Amino acid sequence: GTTTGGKGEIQQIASVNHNPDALVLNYDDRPPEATPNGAILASTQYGK
Amino acid sequence: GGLSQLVAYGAQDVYLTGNPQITFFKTVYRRYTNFAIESIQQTINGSVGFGNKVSTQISRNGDLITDIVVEFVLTKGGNGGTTYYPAEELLQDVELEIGGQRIDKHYNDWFRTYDALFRMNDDRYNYRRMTDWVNNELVGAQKRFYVPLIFFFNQTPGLALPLIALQYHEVKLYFTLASQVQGVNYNGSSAIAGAAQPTMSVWVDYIFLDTQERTRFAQLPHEYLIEQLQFTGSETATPSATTQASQNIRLNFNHPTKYLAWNFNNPTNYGQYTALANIPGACSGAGTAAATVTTPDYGNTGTYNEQLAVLDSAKIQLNGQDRFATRKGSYFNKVQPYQSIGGVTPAGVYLYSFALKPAGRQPSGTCNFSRIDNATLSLTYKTCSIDATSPAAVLGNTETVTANTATLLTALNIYAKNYNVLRIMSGMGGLAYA
Amino acid sequence: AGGLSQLVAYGAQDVYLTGNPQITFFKTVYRRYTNFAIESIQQTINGSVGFGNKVSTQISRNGDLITDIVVEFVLTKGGNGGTTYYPAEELLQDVELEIGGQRIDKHYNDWFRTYDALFRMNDDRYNYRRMTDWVNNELVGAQKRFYVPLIFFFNQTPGLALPLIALQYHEVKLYFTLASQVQGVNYNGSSAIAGAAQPTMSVWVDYIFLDTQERTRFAQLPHEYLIEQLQFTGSETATPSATTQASQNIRLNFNHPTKYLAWNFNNPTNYGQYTALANIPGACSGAGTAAATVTTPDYGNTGTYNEQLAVLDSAKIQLNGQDRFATRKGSYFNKVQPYQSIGGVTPAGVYLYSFALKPAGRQPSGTCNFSRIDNATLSLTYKTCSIDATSPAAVLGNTETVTANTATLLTALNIYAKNYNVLRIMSGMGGLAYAN
Amino acid sequence: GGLSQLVAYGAQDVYLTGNPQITFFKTVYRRYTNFAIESIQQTINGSVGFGNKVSTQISRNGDLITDIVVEFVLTKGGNGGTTYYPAEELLQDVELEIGGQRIDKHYNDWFRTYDALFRMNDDRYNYRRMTDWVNNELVGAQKRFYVPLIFFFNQTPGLALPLIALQYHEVKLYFTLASQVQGVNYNGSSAIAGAAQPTMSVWVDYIFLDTQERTRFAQLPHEYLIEQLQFTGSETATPSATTQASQNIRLNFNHPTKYLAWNFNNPTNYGQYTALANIPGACSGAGTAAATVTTPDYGNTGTYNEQLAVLDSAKIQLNGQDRFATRKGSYFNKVQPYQSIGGVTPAGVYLYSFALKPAGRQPSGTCNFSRIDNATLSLTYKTCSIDATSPAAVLGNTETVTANTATLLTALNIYAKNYNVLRIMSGMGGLAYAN
Amino acid sequence: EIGGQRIDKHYNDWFRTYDALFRMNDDRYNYRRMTDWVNNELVGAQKR
Amino acid sequence: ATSPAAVLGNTETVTANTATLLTALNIYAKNYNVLRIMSGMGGLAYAN
Amino acid sequence: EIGGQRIDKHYNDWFRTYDALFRMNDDRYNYRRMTDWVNNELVGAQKR
Amino acid sequence: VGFGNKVSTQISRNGDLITDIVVEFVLTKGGNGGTTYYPAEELLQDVEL
């Protein structure tokens, strides 16, 4: 009747089989590129 | 006197004062950097009006940004009791973008849910004063409302956005204004003739750093542990007077999650998280001959009267197994907030935390849904058999039933709050995990 | 112009604020933490749930550490709104905390009421009331689930989570006493309410599941957790006379480093009644009208802030026969003490005297060690009960040294002391560092 | 169960639990020094009564001092609704002096402004309980009031004043009692016949240190970072019933200022920061035939109805130039305290912080007026065109207008709170910076 | 529950569905005899 | 449903009008898992 | 306009001219269906 | 743009140097001749550089 006090609930084996990573993207994979932010450069589109 | 206590020393004191480490009677203040703060108006692009989408690019006046308050000027379309947090309702949503990447996005309902759950006491009251009319104002009354934003950088300087370290990225806020605001341009389904269009302004509080702090921000890489909101709308298993509705909602969430929060509502009436009834405050005209349980007392739309809440019980399942034992709706409405927030949550608003202290900034425990194949929220609803027009039935009833009008709470909004990292380097940035 | 105009305005007086900077406000570094999870698990309740019955539970060991404990009750209203007052609190007559067969602590329904009266506040207090009472004018026959959180040291902070994992050979139990009667639920004053339902009870414990390394350390290492305990005794009140000022010297049979003392005067007839009854709004059943009586409280408004109905005129605490502080008025203990030490508002009839800078927190901040005091005495002077309680003018217009004639009903006194002990855990067993 | 969450572990947890630094389940309390706290009555010198100047020297009973509470006994000269925080009103001002050097000074109005901005919820209510009658007490009622002081050392143990290290300097408190207190000895301008004079007692809570800590405080030099209140009264560019007034009030401030605070008021009625009106609580008799918009409902003097306040907009200039964009009066009344304090500020009371956390002890950004030649508080006032006796006009009006009775708010009180250094050396002290 | 872990759970309807599919003949009848009244018992009848 | 001629004599693709009362659907599945016991304690090998 | 300078510009008449010359068959109809009312819609009819 | 609104413009980098700046407005009369006074000047409440 050894469990007169208590014993810790054992851990199960939770295996992720599906694909729950379908909305994320690693920053170390697709790093963000530059975009303008107010310091617009010259309108050099003044061709010959 | 004081000495008769001081002298009472002994073995039991060693754990409190032996080998002292601190005192309480001399505070060492920490020299901080030289910085200043300024409130600067941003320019809103587009046409401001009900139902329109407008936006702003946050200017580079300072080095870092924190608090953002959106001002709105509205006029009452009717008398006192007709509006409910109308400036909150008006700002339908706000989307936060850095370099074209969506960092976060809030909804008017989130602001209502968030406030209902996490603000409290006088802060909550003062908040109401900035978004509604709370002194029994009458038709035509004009007020400027201030809607603070609640993005991570709008809550703590510790997470101020380093515009300075983003030399190559635009930073924007996109604001959607509601097509209608109750008691301002519409009254229930009716339009209010002559209602004025809103005037809007976005204010950003910018931090100016001194020379060395400024240089470090501009040149060093940064990693900010920040908050994000996840949100999807769902259809509520329609409550019934004949049987208890039940539902199993897959939770399409990801990332380490601090907590889940949700509410049920009648989408017709902003903030109507509970059923309507003929008891004081619970419906338009409650208590008299003119009472109706089809329209709320708008000024008192929210309530703490759980008898009008529809949820009977709930649990969260992970990959088919219960995460915790099923608890009553009242457990998620009152206990979770007691344990985790310390505020008082309105009926119809629920919280389940995965964190020890979800109301704070530090990640005191999270549930990573990116590693859970199937997270599901399981709900059981009350039987909506109480005749809402009869106080004896409304107030003298049992645990598993609610007002018949609860059947109209057909919308379900499920939110999740998670932690991500905003990485900034070489003048540009984005999230560690999309 | 703008914020830059402030930064440039820098001189000698700025050096003591920002020279040689140590910190910033714009770079918060959050500390990485261990991997853990929280689960709310229903416990087995042994015994028989009912009014006046005792029940008990052995906390299961599903998780490794425990914190929050909530007792759920389902009660019904035996009368209309205004007839109950925190009935879930009245029902939970007392709770004993036991480890390995040894009592660690014990709280009482009155303590829960006193604790709340002093330490909870604002919306916390309101939400707290929502979980223990009917606050929306519910009517007779209404049924509601109440949640009464326990407030033992491990039930207030994760910092003191009880290491059940390290207590392998000691069972941990909670023992509960349910009140024989609960106002507005099964009795209306002395009259039983026919048909009153028995309570339904459920005890929930929130468990912490630790990952491998943190769990292993807790399981194997000895621990010393600095904890709180509540000392409590009931005493007869030197009930004030309507002719004079009663006085009393109560020896305080307390021990250990005490954070604070707290006390109240009450009428055991009515749970939570710490003040006199009167025909002033909220101070009695029917107050304000012809039907008013000052023999029965407005139960839904049992507690007040109207100190005119309180009975303590003044008090001092003696230690080893020496005055600890100059004698102060009852209102000093009721209003100033908690202003300074807690920051909330304390109801009339409830008094606090702190030996600590911040008694509301966990961190020790000064204590009175009664294990070195042979004569700790609480000296109380009561107000004269000469005011005709049935005449609101008599009450509302009275003076400092007097109270209601109905204040003589407050015949019982509750004196509490909250102290610090150490819970030592080693080799699968625990115990306290100090017995006395 | 809970284990199913623990196992949900992957790359996104690296920032939260990888290389863990702390736990939450093994709290560490810091061991502290041995001390005791005693509340000891000081002797108040001088004649106590309305309008009198009194003072006390704080005895060196303990080693350090923190809280100070002044007790007063006042009686009601009329029924409920006739008083408003009367013990606060009674203590007209308090000065703190060390060695003859003035350190600081509080005013009854400051206590009200301070409270309006920084106390909150039940703290604010409890405070009211210690300074007023809040249970509908009637004429003849008697109460002991407790007015805590709010000098820098009265708010935190961290700034406990080291009387032990001030061996050659005496420390005094000077207190001015008001000539009149509403609902106690006067009802508006009318004296109340038979009114009682107040009873006063000053209490200081002392810290008794153990030997090692006491020795260090007594012998070592100290530099305490302290708060000071700067204050001047100004005339208000009172708005008309026609045009909007404007004003640029030169701010004679010095030192690294945490924040400015201000209010407009009617000097006759303590705590009146808004216009009177015939709406419930906004005037004596409001809501009925007897309503008078010339006298407040004193017990309900304070309100959150900003419509009755007079500030349209304001800005602060430094060196003749805008410090921030002009904002509306409601910004300074509702948003500033939302952002910086977290309580609810009553109508007519305004705050502008130069600091991130103005409600705290720790410095968090200041405006150093010792390096500013000129600065002004620039104000624009609302038009006083609303008939205060008509709720339709009072409650259905526009953003830029207020009550015709708002022109009674002719006084302006501008406060500033800054940080200085209190130096205690060789048994003596004073402040590091004169200006 | 074993060791604090849910192992399984049955429902009244499952017992009915299970029976409908897997019990049979006299095995099913005998089962019915233990859960219902099958000899035309009348109001007030008591059964184990 | 109240007319046996209609109830007993009808086609394969139809049923009773009272069949609309069967609004609840109960779906069950029975599977295998492994209950492991070791060193005096046990629980399931797989969670999902 | 790119970089502050006009790169090109179309006119309503050009859209009509362009269509007249370069769209055809059901492409032309699909286009017309997105710019006009072609199902005998009546006064007050609303169309995106 | 409208009455009471705050609007702004960033000057494009089309040329190398800039001088004259003219703000155009189109307004309508809400009354007859004699009812307006420099209304476009009044309208441009302010401009910040």
From Swiss-Prot, chain A:
Kindly summarize what the UniProt induction comment says about this protein's expression.
Expressed in the early-late phase of the viral replicative cycle.
| Domain of life (superkingdom) | Viruses
Query: Which compartments is it annotated to reside in?
Result: Virion
Any domain commentary?
A: The hydrophobic region might anchor the protein in the underlying inner membrane.
Q: What does this protein do?
A: One of the minor capsid proteins that constitute a network internal to the major capsid proteins and outside the lipid membrane. The minor capsid proteins glue and stabilize the capsomers. Also acts as a molecular tape measure protein that determines the size of the viral capsid.
Q: How does it assemble?
A: Interacts with the major capsid protein.
Q: What name is this protein filed under?
A: Minor capsid protein P2
Name the species this protein comes from. Answer: Paramecium bursaria Chlorella virus 1
Q: Which residues of the full protein are shown?
A: 241 to 288 of 576
UniProtKB/Swiss-Prot annotation, chain B:
Query: Single GO molecular-function term?
Result: lipid binding
Tell me, using the record's free text, what induces this protein: Expressed in the late phase of the viral replicative cycle.
Q: Which residues are glycosylated?
A: N278, N300, N397, N404
Location(s), subcellular: Virion
Coarsely, its chief localization is virion
For this record, the Gene Ontology CC terms, alphabetical, are: viral capsid
Post-translational modifications: Myristoylated at the C-terminus.
InterPro entries in alphabetical order = Capsid_N (IPR031654), MCP_C (IPR007542), MCP_C_sf (IPR038519), VP_dsDNA_II (IPR016112)
Q: Which UniProt keywords are given for this protein, alphabetically ordered? A: Capsid protein, Glycoprotein, Late protein, Lipid-binding, Virion
Write out the function statement from the record.
Major capsid protein self-assembles to form an icosahedral capsid with a pseudo T=169 symmetry, about 190 nm in diameter, and consisting of 1680 major capsid proteins trimers. The capsid consists in 5040 copies of the major capsid protein (hexamers), 60 copies of the penton protein (pentamers) and 1800 minor capsid proteins of different types. The minor capsid proteins form a hexagonal network below the outer capsid shell, stabilizing the capsid by binding neighboring capsomers together.
Family note:
Belongs to the NCLDV major capsid protein family.
* Additional record remark: The viral capsid possesses up to five major capsid protein variants. They behave as asymmetric capsid components.
Q: What is this protein called?
A: Major capsid protein
